[PDB]
Amino acid sequence: HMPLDPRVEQFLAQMPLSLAEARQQFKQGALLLDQMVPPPPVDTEDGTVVTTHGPVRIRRYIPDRLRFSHPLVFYHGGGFVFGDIDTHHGLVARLCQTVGATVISVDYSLAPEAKFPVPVAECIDVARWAAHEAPGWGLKPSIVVAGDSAGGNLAAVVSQRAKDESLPIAAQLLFYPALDMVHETPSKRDFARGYLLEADAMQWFGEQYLRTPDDVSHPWASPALSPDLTGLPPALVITAEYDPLRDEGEAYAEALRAAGVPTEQIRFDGMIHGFMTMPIFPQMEAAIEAVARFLERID
Ligand SMILES: COC(=O)c1ccccc1C(=O)OC
Numbered sequence: 001h002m003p004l005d006p007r008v009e010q011f012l013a014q015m016p017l018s019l020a021e022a023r024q025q026f027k028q029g030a031l032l033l034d035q036m037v038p039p040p041p042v043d044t045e046d047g048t049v050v051t052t053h054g055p056v057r058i059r060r061y062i063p064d065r066l067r068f069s070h071p072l073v074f075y076h077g078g079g080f081v082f083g084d085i086d087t088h089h090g091l092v093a094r095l096c097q098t099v100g101a102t103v104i105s106v107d108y109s110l111a112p113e114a115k116f117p118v119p120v121a122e123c124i125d126v127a128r129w130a131a132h133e134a135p136g137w138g139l140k141p142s143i144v145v146a147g148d149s150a151g152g153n154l155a156a157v158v159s160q161r162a163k164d165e166s167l168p169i170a171a172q173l174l175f176y177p178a179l180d181m182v183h184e185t186p187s188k189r190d191f192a193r194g195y196l197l198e199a200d201a202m203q204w205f206g207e208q209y210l211r212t213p214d215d216v217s218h219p220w221a222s223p224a225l226s227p228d229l230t231g232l233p234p235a236l237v238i239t240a241e242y243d244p245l246r247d248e249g250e251a252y253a254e255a256l257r258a259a260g261v262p263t264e265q266i267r268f269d270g271m272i273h274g275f276m277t278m279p280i281f282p283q284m285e286a287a288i289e290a291v292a293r294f295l296e297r298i299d
Pocket residue numbers: 032033035036
């Protein structure tokens with residue numbers, strides 16, 4: 001156990017209704033963080049992708065200077081219930097400008113209004129769209145999927161489904177993903193209260209997203225359960241030391257490595273879940289630099 005990062009420690013010490021109110025409170029939090037540490041200017045265009053489960057709003061981010069030859073498709077976190085393209089703008093704008101990549105940020109359908117596995121399907125369909133469009137942006141058709149938390153779950157599942165769905169994926173970027181809804185890990189037991197993402201909330205999220213308790217063992221909910229990880233896309237797996245989801249993330253990175261998948265596994269010490277959408281922490285930019293350096297090695 002390394003000491004908490006000082007800024008994280010202060011943030012947690014200063015920490016202090018309806019579904020709609022809760023969603024609004026989550027959005028207001030993101031806004032305050034962006035007011036504290038403004039995002040870089042970036043050109044964007046909004047659109048909508050026709051998926052097998054309905055229209056899905058997207059936002060395309062165009063870098064000042066294009067330096068990376070694959071589109072990124074980014075799925076935001078928020079427990080499958082909260083978040084949108086605006087809440088994750090601070091992260092995505094930085095990924096775009098720092099990597100020098102076009103990024104497609106995805107506004108997938110939220111639970112409980114949409115249930116598992118609807119967002120998985122949507123996220124596959126958007127990735128497929130991106131692969132098809134890529135040549136017309138002067139890019140390679142293989143995409144890089146990315147996501148934080150619940151979004152990292154989606155990125156991991158899309159990656160596992162990709163060969164079966166004829167979807168070319170060059171890499172997967174998993175930021176403190178949720179990967180195993182079945183097993184308790186030491187981290188999930190020991191950091192379950194007081195570090196922003198809590199047990200009670202994870203349980204509640206599961207109740208909104210899943211159709212029944214049996215869905216926890218479904219491979220499209222718990223990608224960590226998949227016994228054959230050979231041939232999956234190169235993986236960057238970023239974890240936070242004091243995150244209940246830490247151990248499942250690191251174990252999945254170990255499993256990928258042992259299955260011959262090129263894998264970079266980075267734990268940010270003293271950090272908490274969510275830190276890559278919390279620009280008050282310099283570790284957010286360090287992790288984005290890790291993304292750029294990992295992606296340099298893909299081609
Ligand atoms: C000073 O507190 C504010 O009202 C505020 C304003 C802009 C950005 C962030 C914050 C903030 O940290 O809220 C607690």
